[PDB]
Design an enzyme around this catalytic site. Sequence first.
Site, PDB file in Angstrom:
ATOM      1  N   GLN A  36     -59.722  78.286  22.838  1.00  0.00           N
ATOM      2  CA  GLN A  36     -61.105  77.910  23.100  1.00  0.00           C
ATOM      3  C   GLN A  36     -61.224  76.928  24.252  1.00  0.00           C
ATOM      4  O   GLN A  36     -62.342  76.520  24.584  1.00  0.00           O
ATOM      5  CB  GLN A  36     -61.742  77.322  21.838  1.00  0.00           C
ATOM      6  CG  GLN A  36     -61.413  75.864  21.547  1.00  0.00           C
ATOM      7  CD  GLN A  36     -61.827  75.448  20.139  1.00  0.00           C
ATOM      8  OE1 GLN A  36     -61.445  76.086  19.157  1.00  0.00           O
ATOM      9  NE2 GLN A  36     -62.625  74.390  20.037  1.00  0.00           N
ATOM     10  N   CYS A  42     -65.176  76.342  17.839  1.00  0.00           N
ATOM     11  CA  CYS A  42     -64.297  76.928  16.828  1.00  0.00           C
ATOM     12  C   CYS A  42     -65.095  77.803  15.865  1.00  0.00           C
ATOM     13  O   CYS A  42     -64.673  78.915  15.526  1.00  0.00           O
ATOM     14  CB  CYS A  42     -63.512  75.851  16.072  1.00  0.00           C
ATOM     15  SG  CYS A  42     -64.448  74.604  15.199  1.00  0.00           S
ATOM     16  N   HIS A 174     -64.051  70.729  12.371  1.00  0.00           N
ATOM     17  CA  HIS A 174     -63.402  71.815  13.088  1.00  0.00           C
ATOM     18  C   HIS A 174     -63.290  73.000  12.141  1.00  0.00           C
ATOM     19  O   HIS A 174     -63.091  72.814  10.940  1.00  0.00           O
ATOM     20  CB  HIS A 174     -62.020  71.388  13.593  1.00  0.00           C
ATOM     21  CG  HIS A 174     -61.553  72.144  14.796  1.00  0.00           C
ATOM     22  ND1 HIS A 174     -62.241  72.125  15.991  1.00  0.00           N
ATOM     23  CD2 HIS A 174     -60.464  72.925  15.001  1.00  0.00           C
ATOM     24  CE1 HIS A 174     -61.603  72.868  16.876  1.00  0.00           C
ATOM     25  NE2 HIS A 174     -60.520  73.362  16.303  1.00  0.00           N
ATOM     26  N   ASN A 204     -55.180  78.716  14.659  1.00  0.00           N
ATOM     27  CA  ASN A 204     -56.100  77.840  15.358  1.00  0.00           C
ATOM     28  C   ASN A 204     -56.688  78.569  16.565  1.00  0.00           C
ATOM     29  O   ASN A 204     -56.580  79.793  16.699  1.00  0.00           O
ATOM     30  CB  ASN A 204     -55.395  76.548  15.756  1.00  0.00           C
ATOM     31  CG  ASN A 204     -56.360  75.387  15.918  1.00  0.00           C
ATOM     32  OD1 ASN A 204     -57.573  75.579  15.998  1.00  0.00           O
ATOM     33  ND2 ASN A 204     -55.825  74.180  15.974  1.00  0.00           N
TER      34      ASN A 204
HETATM   35  C1  LIG Z   1     -68.043  73.933   9.971  1.00  0.00           C
HETATM   36  C2  LIG Z   1     -68.506  72.782  10.861  1.00  0.00           C
HETATM   37  C3  LIG Z   1     -68.559  71.534   9.974  1.00  0.00           C
HETATM   38  C4  LIG Z   1     -67.529  72.622  12.032  1.00  0.00           C
HETATM   39  C5  LIG Z   1     -68.113  71.829  13.226  1.00  0.00           C
HETATM   40  N1  LIG Z   1     -67.222  70.948  13.979  1.00  0.00           N
HETATM   41  C6  LIG Z   1     -67.056  70.983  15.433  1.00  0.00           C
HETATM   42  O1  LIG Z   1     -66.308  70.200  15.920  1.00  0.00           O
HETATM   43  C7  LIG Z   1     -67.796  71.974  16.346  1.00  0.00           C
HETATM   44  O2  LIG Z   1     -68.144  71.342  17.552  1.00  0.00           O
HETATM   45  C8  LIG Z   1     -66.946  73.213  16.655  1.00  0.00           C
HETATM   46  C9  LIG Z   1     -65.625  72.900  17.382  1.00  0.00           C
HETATM   47  O3  LIG Z   1     -64.923  73.839  17.854  1.00  0.00           O
HETATM   48  O4  LIG Z   1     -65.197  71.722  17.507  1.00  0.00           O
HETATM   49  C10 LIG Z   1     -69.619  71.564  13.396  1.00  0.00           C
HETATM   50  O5  LIG Z   1     -70.288  72.330  14.000  1.00  0.00           O
HETATM   51  N2  LIG Z   1     -70.196  70.349  12.834  1.00  0.00           N
HETATM   52  C11 LIG Z   1     -71.608  70.026  12.976  1.00  0.00           C
HETATM   53  C12 LIG Z   1     -72.520  71.105  12.388  1.00  0.00           C
HETATM   54  C13 LIG Z   1     -73.982  70.814  12.737  1.00  0.00           C
HETATM   55  C14 LIG Z   1     -74.412  71.562  14.001  1.00  0.00           C
HETATM   56  N3  LIG Z   1     -73.714  71.031  15.165  1.00  0.00           N
HETATM   57  C15 LIG Z   1     -74.390  70.257  16.199  1.00  0.00           C
HETATM   58  N4  LIG Z   1     -75.814  69.977  16.118  1.00  0.00           N
HETATM   59  N5  LIG Z   1     -73.733  69.826  17.179  1.00  0.00           N
END
Ligand SMILES: CC(C)C[C@H](NC(=O)[C@@H](O)CC(=O)O)C(=O)NCCCCNC(N)=[NH2+]
Length: 241
Positions: A36, A42, A174, A204
């Site tokens: 990615q 992710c 993630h 991953n």
């Molecule tokens: C399943 C979820 C918990 C994984 C996630 N974590 C991340 O780090 C994302 O940016 C995806 C990534 O590849 O890092 C994520 O999207 N967290 C926040 C969810 C709320 C929507 N995201 C916003 N508004 N940035």
Amino acid sequence: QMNYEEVIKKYKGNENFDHAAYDWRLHSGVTPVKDQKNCGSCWAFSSIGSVESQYAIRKNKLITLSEQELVDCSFKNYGCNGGLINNAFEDMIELGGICTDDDYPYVSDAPNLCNIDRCTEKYGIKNYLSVPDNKLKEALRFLGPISISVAVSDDFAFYKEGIFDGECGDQLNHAVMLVGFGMKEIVNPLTKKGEKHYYYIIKNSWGQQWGERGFINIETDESGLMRKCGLGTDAFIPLIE
Ligand SMILES: CC(C)C[C@H](NC(=O)[C@@H](O)CC(=O)O)C(=O)NCCCCNC(N)=[NH2+]
């Protein structure tokens, strides 16, 4: 939208199953790891991964799919700045399939335009369901690889081999894939006695350079309920049957 306790019977029947090891890398169940690069997407690679696996099992075809299209067009997910797994699968069905990763290639954090017309024939799902926080090993052995959420640290990135159970994270940050479970009998270097160390196997989105040729293992237990770093609290898997 279907539920676990029913769909399980469609495949499980109910033999009970060797809780020691089953690994999808070995039964035509795991597609190649992708990178990615710079872009927090992710949620996209995890979901697209889980479907790629279902196609390679339940209809035995090999496909790379455009996680790009998903970022450009999934609107209940906030592009390169994050997203959620279910939201993807929901947006996935709404779009009615995603383009081959060749007609619609990936380009990380580069701005690109959602363009449904970029390919000809598209590859969809039919539904998705959630996995309960416990019957994981049962799910994988019979249903397939899973998309899941997790909490991560900087200790985490430097992983390169063996069992990891180091520093976790404050909250889930993630999204990645479960691909199986296993165990190596390793000898406690102090007591020096046969100790069975159980591990989950993971894919991953950071290239083959990283970890075990792209993967990484995490300790757990025979029952499969040690969910280290909030493992799988969010946990969905896509279906096409
Ligand atoms: C399943 C979820 C918990 C994984 C996630 N974590 C991340 O780090 C994302 O940016 C995806 C990534 O590849 O890092 C994520 O999207 N967290 C926040 C969810 C709320 C929507 N995201 C916003 N508004 N940035």
